[PDB]
Design a protein around this ligand. Structure first.
Ligand SMILES: O=C(CO)[C@@H](O)[C@@H](O)CO
Lengths: 546, 543
């Protein structure tokens, strides 16, 4: 008895058939988008794309289904009770009355604004700016729910750009859709929007709904009624049944028609249940280029600098919290490409090892505090708790003897202090954090990072055991949408007890370490506040010169 | 006519022959100290010099004279002079020979020459300052509020506290620069420079009172009139005539003028043509020694010291310094510059430092977006705090090697501005800058940044052996105008002071950007080093 989770990424999509009793995947096949990311030119044309543009081809999404789901079936029958997907969040596209992408229409095929706008599409920053300006000026209740910053990557700004720069595309649009919802509408035939994206990317709230009709009007009179027209529809919680798989699609996929299809999920949020978290007190960290911190709570609290909070946003029956750490994995990448000497590089090749690996081993010989170094993990600004892109990195404690492995550890330590700033911001507001859960590739290749993390927050850290976490998550909600009656489950908690996967070995704080780090952290907090809360804005002035 | 200048460094002494008519080097020879730097085990023995110990062998200095001077002659002279490293002392007997040369004392490491690098006397120095503070000793200010572990007193106190037998057997402690000149003339005459900057000597008031030293240790009362006794004579004064059996062994006429010993940094001032106030001389190298002249003694925050006749007779000579400048750049190449940059320099067949200067060279002030506190090795001037560390601010995912290299170059220019500004606006004015060392020769970008940050024109040393020329210039003054020399260092410099025709002038728009960056520098400089946040010290503690 299994379900299928289709994990749609930035470059490719992949299907995984997961066993509904243990959570193991016996088969997965990834289908790359044959148009990939459209950042240079529209599919086989010479219509150049402006600055900060990211687009994608709608059909590549359906092709993952008509290619990968069949392939996974090959490697077994009608014991596939359901299918679900996770998508990169706020990857929207405008569709017609029949629910098809405008980019597929004769007239619109050549207007860039008719295509899919990838999450990475940052072209609408100015609109995101205005939306935040008006919300501030107006004093809108939703503003603090997103830390006082609606991203350019999200829905409202993205549609407003279309309206302005391409009004003909706007009016032609019957409804704008998150790619996660659109994709399920192609397997089900109906449009049913999930709670995760509406909540985190479309300024939605379960109790107040969307912002006032007056709020949008004050952005552009045309935008009044947007919420009841181009963004109309019931918001339904994760795990619910979008509807049945269409027979014509079922044929193309190797699946039976009518089987349960869950409402779209988001790649990051989908990780929470895949790692067994379906209750408060446990923070989940999707760790990689940066970290997306997610946490469940029983009450709504306006945590400083959080990215968002929404009921049924992550786990039905709980408020979902999301926070973000701007740069962690990127900082280590930066340091290897621009900050580590050739000597350590030679040393690494000298012993047949990768430099990252050599740097980790050498820094693990150091005792916390031994380097005498302290850093502010702000190489790429700050999102959570400080919400300021106008901040830079700092390294302190240099002596003529400072070594690359020492400064490397400082960067590791700095990111952990950054994570702690976030965990304390929640905990100190009632949104408790007792345990840490890590998923991603970072906790795989870098054990030292996980130990510093455990030492600094003084909390036990579990690591995901699944290879394809987001996919498992999708598979999990697929079973919940299926139901107990057909072999699946009646709740994500129940589904989590048997499907959730964490590695048996966890990282535990070493009291001797937790003690040194407590002191190093206090020094970090102080500089964090000095350089980031107003006393000295030198960082901002340094940028203005650059 | 010609005089010889002998420049004794930390590992080698170099003899140079210069033309008293224009101060042009025409021959020079360098002889490395046979026993180099004694700092692990005493010469062939298992005597481990544990701790921050640094000794040296006294004959290695005379070995220099009896090698390089004869050499320079083969490859007349009116006089000779020397410039030595600052506060490299040794105890001698009534014959003026070092105790380490005595069979029954060589094994004790406290009978050897204590090199300036010797830092094992910190505590004795801490006690000095503590006592000096508790007493309100008027000399403490003259040295920026902190006497060094490298200087004479702390060193003589360590010897007493630890090897009281060496102290008692010691007839007199002497500065190497004073000792070496004694070997040439048989007369022991102590110069004002080393007595002033080290040994707490003041021209008008003299040494600190007997009570002060007594207050340190009863045994030290009278130190000033026994083990450190002696008249202090100003630079350029004739120490005596060369001894008969010294001259033949050196290949020079006996009786020639042998000027009182000089110090490498200080002797650089007249060599660059500076002999009056308003002109700051920077001997720029691994670190930087800032030297300035003035008429009225002024208290200046964080100065190393100020002494009448300490540099040029008839003036108050001020000294300030920067812990690390060249060392920071070196630390960067060795531990902070990416292999990518290393490769590029290689494929282009040029030093990585050179590539880094060129790439950094293309940026405009403020273009890097970086700011640094040049305290990798703490700071000496104006703050006088060994317990401070470096900082780098402004990193982004796109920061590049040459950008942080630019920030470091700039950080050291800011540190120098702090120094010059401490002098200026305090009475001792700085209208011009003069630079010596390798950096002025090896890094033009740094010279221009200094120009733009300090907003002062900068002239560069024209000689290749600036210190040697200085010692040589003084040698001429010590032989008078009667036999081919000068009656003063002023006249001598009017013709021997060498400065390159090409000077670095401040570029208006650059000074404006730097006036901006400097203020940011000052804010952090005060935040991290003046009391608001002592995280550097606490961070050091957890080390
Ligand atoms: O919305 C998100 C992050 O919350 C996802 O689309 C990520 O894949 C973006 O990197």
């Amino acid at each position: 008895k299994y379900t299928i989770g289709v994990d749609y990424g930035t470059e490719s999509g992949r299907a995984v058939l997961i066993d509904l009793s243990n959570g193991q995947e016996l088969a997965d096949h990834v289908t790359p988008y044959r148009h990939g990311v459209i950042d240079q030119y529209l599919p086989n044309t010479n219509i150049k794309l402006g600055h900060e543009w990211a687009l994608q081809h709608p059909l590549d999404y359906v092709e993952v289904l008509t290619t990968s789901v069949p392939a996974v079936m090959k490697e077994d029958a009608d014991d596939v009770i359901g299918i679900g997907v996770d998508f990169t969040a706020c990857t929207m596209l405008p569709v017609d009355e029949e629910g098809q992408p405008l980019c597929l229409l004769a007239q619109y095929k050549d207007n860039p604004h008719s295509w899919v706008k990838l999450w990475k599409h940052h072209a609408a920053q100015d609109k995101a700016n205005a939306i935040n300006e008006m919300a501030e000026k107006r004093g809108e209740a939703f503003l603090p729910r997103y830390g006082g910053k609606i991203s350019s990557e999200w829905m409202i700004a993205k549609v407003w750009q279309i309206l302005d720069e391409a009004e003909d595309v706007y009016n032609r649009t019957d409804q704008f859709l998150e790619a996660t919802d659109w994709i399920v509408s192609q397997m089900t035939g109906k449009i049913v929007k999930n709670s995760c994206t509406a909540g985190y990317k479309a300024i939605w709230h379960k109790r107040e709904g969307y912002p006032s009709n007056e709020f949008f009007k004050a952005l552009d009179p045309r935008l009044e009624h947007l919420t009841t027209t181009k963004l109309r529809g019931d918001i339904v919680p994760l795990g619910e049944r979008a509807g049945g798989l269409l027979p014509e699609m079922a044929e193309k996929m190797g699946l039976n028609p009518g089987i349960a299809v869950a409402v779209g999920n988001v790649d990051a949020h989908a990780a929470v249940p895949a790692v067994g978290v379906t209750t408060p007190g446990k923070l989940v960290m999707a760790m990689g280029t940066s970290i997306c911190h997610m946490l469940l709570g029983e009450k709504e609290q306006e945590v400083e600098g959080m990215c968002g909070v929404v009921e049924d946003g992550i786990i039905p029956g709980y408020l979902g919290y999301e926070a973000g750490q701007s740069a962690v994995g990127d900082i280590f990448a930066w340091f290897v490409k621009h900050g580590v000497s050739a000597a350590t590089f030679d040393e690494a090749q000298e012993k047949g090892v990768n430099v990252h690996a050599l740097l980790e081993e050498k820094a693990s010989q150091l005792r916390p505090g031994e380097s005498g170094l302290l850093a502010l993990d702000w190489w790429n600004g700050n999102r959570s708790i400080l919400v300021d892109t106008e901040l830079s990195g700092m390294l302190l404690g240099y002596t003529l003897q400072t070594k690359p492995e020492e400064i490397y550890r400082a960067l590791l330590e700095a990111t952990a202090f950054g994570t702690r700033a976030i965990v304390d911001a929640f905990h100190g507001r009632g949104v408790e954090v007792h345990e840490l859960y890590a998923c991603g590739g970072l906790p795989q290749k870098n054990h030292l990072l996980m130990q510093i993390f455990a030492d600094v927050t003084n909390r036990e850290i579990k690591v995901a055991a699944s290879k394809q976490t987001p996919a498992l998550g999708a598979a999990m909600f697929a079973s919940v949408a299926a139901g107990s009656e057909v072999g699946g489950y009646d709740s994500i908690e129940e589904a989590a007890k048997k499907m959730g996967r964490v590695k048996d070995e966890t990282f535990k704080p070493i009291p001797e370490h937790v003690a040194i780090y407590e002191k190093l952290y206090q020094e970090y907090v102080t500089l964090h506040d000095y350089f980031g809360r107003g006393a000295n804005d030198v960082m901002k002035r340094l940028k203005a010169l650059k």
